[PDB]
């Protein structure tokens, strides 16, 4: 019967280990100390502290039923850290989702000297929000019938924390969730059209390259070549790899050269450079596909990391708020399966370090280096 603690403990090790490798990666690797990682490091801290302080002590309550091994003063303290590190983990993940969106539709303010300050005030707000939501628990302690901790269960009663579980769950989960849902459908939409603005502009670049290869006057070659300059300069905007955008710079440079010959009246000299453009295109055809190939791929991973979020915290926060409202429901049948949904919210702290690092090559090369010492 104590065997279940086996697998429960195999969930604690990755949480401690996984989140500790992220901290060791950002603080020791000189090539990983950019702004957006200082904020991801904070998510690992919360996920680490919840696997190092919350998750281990929560393991004792399953073994020592109706008992509290630690001093009774530390029961309201342990509960304070359960909500704190959890709300922080959720809001960090929420603040990541919104940045993943703004970082796509507008790569503005990409400087390393000024994007690091925004991360420092982005990280502090999350920790202040998480505190403000978890702060009332230690203030108004839990009421117990006994003084000795060996005869009590450390748990928040429905009566003493009724309006807190309701107004606290919204500010911690359903508020950032509402943001994460809209930022998701706006992100999948942000790369649905940009993946389409690249093709239609890429085909506008062909049709004009087809017509100037078949011309008789000097007006058609400069009408189609101007339509290329705009189309080529817009397709550059629809990319997230500077060398593919460098390919458009080379191309546009050749557009201006050939467009300069067209105004001098030399038709057959302009087409000499138009055939050179057809060569510039063939060099970046491969990288044009790997751009859309990486677009349809990034779209699905964003659906999984988002699906796993609602897959793990919903069963708890839905069951939690249900136990506060529904009186017809069997009170003992809800908190019997709620024990399960608590650990599902805990395991999220172990997947977060994985679904945000293993999809990157520089992290893998650095993890195996300290595993290797």
């Amino acid at each position, epitope marked *: 019967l104590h065997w279940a603690a086996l697998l429960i403990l195999m969930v604690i090790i990755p949480t401690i280990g996984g989140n500790t490798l992220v901290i060791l990666a950002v603080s020791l690797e000189k090539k990983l100390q950019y702004a957006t990682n200082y904020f991801l490091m904070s998510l690992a801290v919360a996920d680490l502290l919840v696997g190092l302080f919350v998750m281990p002590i929560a393991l004792l309550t399953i073994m020592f039923e*109706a008992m509290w091994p630690l001093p*009774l*003063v*530390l*029961c*309201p*303290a342990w509960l*304070f850290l359960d909500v704190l590190f959890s709300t922080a983990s959720i809001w960090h993940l929420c603040a990541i989702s919104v940045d993943r969106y703004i970082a796509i539709k507008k790569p503005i303010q990409a400087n390393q000297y000024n994007s690091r300050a925004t991360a420092f005030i982005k990280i502090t707000v999350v920790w202040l929000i998480s505190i403000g939501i978890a702060i009332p628990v*230690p*203030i*108004k*302690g*839990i*009421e*117990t*019938d*006994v*003084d*000795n901790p*060996n*005869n009590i*269960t450390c748990v928040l*009663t*429905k*009566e003493r924390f009724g309006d807190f579980m309701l107004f606290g769950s919204l500010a911690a989960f359903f508020t950032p969730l509402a943001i994460m849902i809209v930022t998701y459908f706006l992100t999948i939409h942000a790369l649905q059209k940009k993946a389409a603005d690249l093709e239609d502009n890429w085909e506008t670049l062909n049709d004009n390259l087809k017509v100037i290869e078949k011309a008789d006057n000097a007006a058609q070659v400069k009408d189609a070549l101007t339509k290329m300059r705009a189309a080529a300069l817009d397709a550059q905007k629809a990319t997230p790899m500077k060398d593919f955008r460098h390919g458009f710079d080379i191309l546009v440079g050749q557009i201006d050269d050939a467009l300069k010959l067209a105004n001098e009246g030399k038709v057959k000299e302009a087409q000499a450079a138009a055939e050179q453009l057809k060569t510039t295109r063939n060099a970046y055809i491969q990288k044009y596909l790997q751009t859309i190939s990486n677009e349809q791929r990034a779209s699905k991973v964003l659906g999984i990391v988002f699906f796993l979020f609602l897959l793990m915290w919903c069963p708890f926060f839905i069951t939690n708020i249900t136990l506060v409202l529904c*009186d017809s429901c069997n*009170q*003992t049948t809800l*908190q019997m399966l709620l024990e399960i949904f608590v650990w599902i919210g805990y395991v999220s702290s172990g997947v977060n370090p994985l679904v945000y690092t293993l999809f990157n090559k520089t992290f893998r090369d650095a993890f195996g280096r300290y595993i290797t010492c």
Partner: antibody
Amino acid sequence: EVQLQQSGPELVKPGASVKLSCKASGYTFTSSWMHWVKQRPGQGLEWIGNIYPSNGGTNYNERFKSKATLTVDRSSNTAYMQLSSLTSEDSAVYFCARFGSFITTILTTYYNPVDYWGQGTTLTVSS
Amino acid sequence: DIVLIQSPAIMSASPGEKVTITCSASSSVSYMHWFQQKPGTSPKLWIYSTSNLASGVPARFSGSGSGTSYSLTISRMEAEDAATYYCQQRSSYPLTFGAGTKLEIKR
């Protein structure tokens, strides 16, 4: 206004089951635990056990563990207690009472006195 | 378990003369409560915590106690407070009570 109305005195044959009720009034019933106390004159007071109405969790004394069974009913807002295999030594007066709760913060622990006892129930066992 | 031994089982004191009920414990206990039961009525708590009086209790009562041995002292003996006195333990389970101490007025 806090009033705990209990069942009436009863004579029950030995070996039969007893069902004592304890009605609550004046408060939400679910805020505090519901303790039970048996008083045999001359020997003093003995603690039977308590129960928590919300979750239905029950705790018994090591002696009265197999004898008494504590239950509640949120619909009728009463606290029951079933004594099975009634012997002759189980003839006493039984009370239902709520006791204060200790409120424990990281700073210190407070205790508030809300102890309110209910009317006794004289139980007698004889043929 | 944690039995509570309170001596004397019965005592008689005249008005003015003063009383000190002792309630000694089997183990070291955090706090100690006190109850007064007048025959024909249910017991009502008189001193919650080691030294704090309940609601409606006269100021002549004064409870003091250490860890093992606790006590209940009064200030001015009057006929209204003649009853049995039990002390109980709320530190740990099972909750234990004292045997009782009956007070007789000497008139």
